[PDB]
C-alpha cells in the first residue's frame, strides 16, 4: 500500500535526520506544483484514496518500533500503528473518517480517539504547552517507546499526548518548515533537548495563514501582513513571500 520512510533515533545524526526529512518531503510532493516558489501539497478535493497517505516507520535503540500515518494534504499525523494495534485522532468529518479506514488494514485492533490531534487539545492532555515540552533525539526516542507501550497499558495519557506533540513537531512541522527542520538539527548536533521558543511556535500556529497569504498574494505581495514572533517574543510582520522562501517548505492547497 502506502510508501514508507524509515527512521531510527539510534545513533541518529544531523545527516541521518536531514535525509529523513528530505525523503519525507519528497513523498508529499511533487506535482511540479509550485506557487510563488513554494511547493504546494496535493489538493484534498478529488484526491484518490491510494495517494492520500504516507507512512513513517520509527524505531529506537531498544528495537521498539511504531509507524506514523501522515496526510499528504496537510503533512499532519493522523494516527499510528504498533504491532497488533492502531490508533487514530478523531476525524474532522466523514470524508476523513472513511479515508483513514484504508490505513493499516491488516491491524487486528483499531481505535479512534474521541479527541483530535490539534495542539490546543494535546497540550491540555499533556498538562503542558509546547513551550514547556522539550524536543530532540532523546525526547523522540522516548516518544516512540511511549506509543509502543500504549496498547498494553504502560503509557499514561499525558505521556501519550506529550509524545504526539513531539512527533508532530519533529516530523510534520519539520517537513513543513526548513526553519523548524534546522532547529531540530541543532538539538541533534549538540545532543541536547530543548523546548521550542516563540519563533518556532508562532510559525507552527501560522502555517495555514501563511499558506493562504502566499497563494492568494499579488505577484508575491501579501494582501495583509502576517505577524510572527522572535525568540524573545518580540512581534514583527511578513509582507512578502520572498522572505519566506528559505523558511517554509510546504503549503496546504488554497483557492
Amino acid at each position: 500500500q502506502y510508501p514508507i520512510i524509515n527512521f531510527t533515533t539510534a545513533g541518529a545524526t544531523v545527516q541521518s535526520y536531514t535525509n529523513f526529512i528530505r525523503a519525507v518531503r519528497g513523498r508529499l510532493t511533487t506535482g511540479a506544483d509550485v506557487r510563488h516558489e513554494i511547493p504546494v501539497l496535493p489538493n484534498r478535493v478529488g484526491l484518490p484514496i491510494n495517494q492520500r497517505f504516507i507512512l513513517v516507520e520509527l524505531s529506537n535503540h531498544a528495537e521498539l518500533s511504531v509507524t506514523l500515518a501522515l496526510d499528504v494534504t496537510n503533512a499532519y499525523v493522523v494516527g499510528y500503528r504498533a504491532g497488533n494495534s492502531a490508533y487514530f485522532f478523531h476525524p474532522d468529518n466523514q470524508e476523513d473518517a472513511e479515508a483513514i479506514t484504508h490505513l493499516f488494514t491488516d491491524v487486528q485492533n483499531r481505535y479512534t480517539f474521541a479527541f483530535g490531534g490539534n495542539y490546543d487539545r494535546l497540550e491540555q492532555l499533556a498538562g503542558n504547552l509546547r513551550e514547556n515540552i522539550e524536543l530532540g533525539n532523546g525526547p523522540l526516542e522516548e516518544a516512540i517507546s511511549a506509543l509502543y507501550y500504549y496498547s498494553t497499558g504502560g503509557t499514561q495519557l499525558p505521556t501519550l499526548a506529550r509524545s504526539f506533540i513531539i512527533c508532530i513537531q519533529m516530523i510534520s512541522e519539520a517537513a513543513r518548515f526548513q526553519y523548524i527542520e534546522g532547529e531540530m538539527r541543532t538539538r541533534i548536533r549538540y545532543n541536547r533537548r530543548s523546548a521550542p521558543d516563540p519563533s518556532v511556535i508562532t510559525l507552527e500556529n501560522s502555517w495555514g495563514r501563511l499558506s493562504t497569504a502566499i497563494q492568494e498574494s499579488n505577484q508575491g505581495a501579501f494582501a495583509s501582513p502576517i505577524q510572527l514572533q522572535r525568540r524573545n517574543g518580540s512581534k514583527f510582520s511578513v509582507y512578502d513571500v520572498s522572505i519566506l522562501i528559505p523558511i517554509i517548505a510546504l503549503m496546504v492547497y488554497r483557492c
Partner: nanobody
Amino acid sequence: NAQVQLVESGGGLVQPGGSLRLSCVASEFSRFTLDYYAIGWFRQAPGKEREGLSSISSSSDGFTSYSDSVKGRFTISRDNAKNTVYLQMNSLKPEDTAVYYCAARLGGWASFSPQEYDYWGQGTQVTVS
C-alpha cells in the same frame, strides 16, 4: 522478552544529615543490558503510597528527573560495566525514612509514575534518626 531481574541494596539506618547510596543491580543474562533501560526510584511510607523521586531515561543524552522533595540532595547515576544504577542520597533527614524501590522499563523514559515501569526491585528500608 524484556525480562530482567533487579536486585537493590545499600539501604539502612543513618544519622540525620547523613548519606546513603542505593544500587539497582541488573542480574546477568537479560537480553538487553541496563543502559537500554529507564530506571525509576520510588519510596513508600507505611500509611502512604508509592512516590517517584529520581529518574533516568534510556535516552542517549542522559536526561534525569528529580522530584522537588529530593532536588539537589539526590543524584541518580549509571555504571554500565557493572550493569548498575546508583542513587546517592545526601543531607538525609527523618522525613526521608521509608522503603525505597528501583524500577525499570526497556527503552523507557524518566517517569514518576509506577505504571510506566515494568520491573521492580525487592525494596530496601531507609531510616533516619
